[PDB]
């Protein structure tokens, strides 16, 4: 069943502030997991933590939020344990309010979420939150905040409502970051015109993004492509709403990882 990859709050947090289903979430997630992970299994990735050596310290959970270093002086990291915090019921939320709910020895060293628990004891403390509902809860506070939250209403200003447009604008804010640089969901949005048609907007976004979804490390190269070509694809096939989508999602994602 797939919103028990949900939470009820999750799903009434989601419906209120995006118009979305958890059947609609689900299959966003499965097409943002596949570039990601490999995998369609995003559920899995709640209590992932990890720090993977990109010098952005360790990265956690569905979306990829992370605790900050030399790569990384303004990560999300921090927000998520605060959201946490504020999701726990604390009546003046913080990251070290979050971070002692867990029990996890840190700080915040400015910007930066500096953990003093080895990686171990880190990981396996975020790895007991897979199925707390107030951490899935926290988990998707954060996800609207840092990207869902702009992409809606990148979307809505528009008058594109669908799941697809808005799964498409929140996988390219996820990779590509959400706004600033000429690269970000705001870049890509600057140079994709102004139809008022979704499908004809939409195929010249995907065009657009596709023209540096492979250099700046977004993806490795053919991998970035094939991750647009997913979105692009869904529109013929009829899928814009992300309904009754599973083969179609399973047929759009078999493109091999390089």
């Known amino acids: 069943s797939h919103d028990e990859n949900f939470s009820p709050e999750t799903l009434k947090f989601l419906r209120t502030n995006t118009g979305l289903d958890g059947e609609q979430w689900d299959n966003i997630m499965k097409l943002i997991n596949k570039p990601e992970q490999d995998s369609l299994d995003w559920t899995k990735y709640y209590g992932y933590c990890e720090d993977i050596g990109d010098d952005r310290g360790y990265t956690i959970g569905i979306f990829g939020a992370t605790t900050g270093g030399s790569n990384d002086k303004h990560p999300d990291g921090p927000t998520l344990f605060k959201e946490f915090d504020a999701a726990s019921g604390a009546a003046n939320p913080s990251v070290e309010g979050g971070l002692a709910r867990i ?33 899935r809860e926290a988990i998707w506070q954060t996800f609207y905040k840092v990207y869902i939250k702009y992409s809606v209403q990148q979307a809505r200003q528009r008058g594109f409502n669908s799941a697809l447009t808005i799964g498409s604008f929140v996988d390219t804010a996820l990779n590509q970051g959400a706004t600033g640089d000429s690269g970000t969901l705001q ?60 083969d179609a999602i399973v047929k759009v994602t078999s493109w091999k990882m390089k």
Not at 103 to 125: A, P, R
């Open 103 to 135: 029990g996890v020895n840190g700080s915040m060293k400015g910007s930066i979420l500096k953990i003093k628990d080895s990686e171990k004891v880190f990981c396996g403390k975020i790895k007991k939150l897979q199925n707390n509902d107030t951490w």
């Open 187 to 246: 870049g890509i949005l600057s140079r994709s015109g102004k139809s008022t048609d979704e499908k004809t907007f939409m195929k010249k976004f995907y065009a657009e993004r596709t023209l540096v979804v492979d250099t700046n490390d977004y993806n490795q190269p053919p991998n970035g492509k094939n991750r647009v070509k997913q979105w692009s694809q869904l529109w013929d096939m009829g899928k814009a709403d992300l309904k009754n989508a599973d």
